[PDB]
Amino acid sequence: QTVTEPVGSYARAERPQDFEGFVWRLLNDGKEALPRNFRTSADALRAPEKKFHLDAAYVPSREGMDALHISGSSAFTPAQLKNVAAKLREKTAGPIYDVDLSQNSHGYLDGIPVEWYGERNWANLGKSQHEALADERHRLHAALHKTVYIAPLGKHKLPEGGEVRRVQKVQTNQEVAEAAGMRYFRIAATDGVWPTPENIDRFLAFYRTLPQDAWLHFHSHSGVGATTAFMVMTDMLKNPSVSLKDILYRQHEIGGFYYGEFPIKTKDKDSWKTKYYREKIVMIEQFYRYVQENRADGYQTPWSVWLKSHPAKA
């Protein structure tokens, strides 16, 4: 019968072989001291971005913020992560986690953070976390003592310039995190789309294990879409008394994405993104509902089970 694919799971209808990886893309040139979009739940709010059409004078409740203990950023060189860790240490005496949100195969070649890139950044689309992590290990390791082309992308998201090098060292994301004094947790979530129910179940089960003074540093590709998603989830889960509006505004105003509805004006070039943007907005609301309606336990029912019997609507 139906649905073939429910709201929250639109990406399952896309075809993986149409998006296979073809180049090692540079994640950061390492010039700056910190990764891009670095931000912390202890930071002061800034004015919202114009594109979102929000009242710059609305001040969301800061209730829960000082105890939230989360941060986000884009990808980083190992030195940049050490800089991150030193900054987070000033704010907490607890275990600091790098929470790595990327489904794609990624790591470090001669210390250079790289990702195996396919169109739309969907090189591991459809792979289980097991399958995605296996590809990663095989592919990083195959690079050692071999010549690779690593480049940034430019016009039409194709390789432009870059360098070619014969790799003398390979490191995993866990290795780079460990070296900076951070614990590591991986969630293999596809870039650009709402995380699968399994992605979220896995985060929730991990969240439940954490010591209360754990600090979560989320990172993804550009440290905007996916990082804000999980920051928002953590914020709601840990602070269920604050309104949906206040969570969305405050997470946006410390420098993340705004996950509420806004005048979405994409190009014809990125017309494919429109339904995924709209899916994310609906699902953020659904997860708010999950938090609100399952707060009476316990959270006896996991997200994926609750969601299956409480579908969001288009």
Looking at the fold, whether 22 and 38 belong to one and the same domain comes out as: no
What is the resolution of the experimental data for this entry, in Å? 2.0
Calculate helix-pair angle for 244-253, 225-238, nearest 10 degrees. 130
What token pair was written down for 133?
Answer: 């992590």
Number of structural domains, the chain?
Answer: 2
CB atoms within 10 A of CB 268: 5
Looking at the fold, whether 24 and 13 belong to one and the same domain comes out as: yes
Least Cα distance to 47 among 242, 254, 202, 310 occurs for 254
- Where among 126, 142, 171 does a domain terminate? 171
Looking at the fold, whether 185 and 62 belong to one and the same domain comes out as: yes
Q: Are 125 and 16 in contact (CB under 8 A)?
A: yes
Looking at the fold, whether 192 and 71 belong to one and the same domain comes out as: yes
Looking at the fold, whether 4 and 81 belong to one and the same domain comes out as: no
CATH number at residue 313: 3.90.190.10
CB atoms within 10 A of CB 68: 20
Residue with tokens 């699968």: 196
Q: Are 30 and 150 in contact (CB under 8 A)?
A: no
Distance CA 198, CA 189 (A): 9
User: Omega before 298 cis (within 30°)?
Assistant: yes
Residue spans of beta strands (DSSP E) within the chain: 21-26, 39-40, 70-73, 96-102, 106-109, 112-118, 147-151, 163-166, 170-171, 183-189, 215-219
**Domain region containing 224:** 30-103+172-314
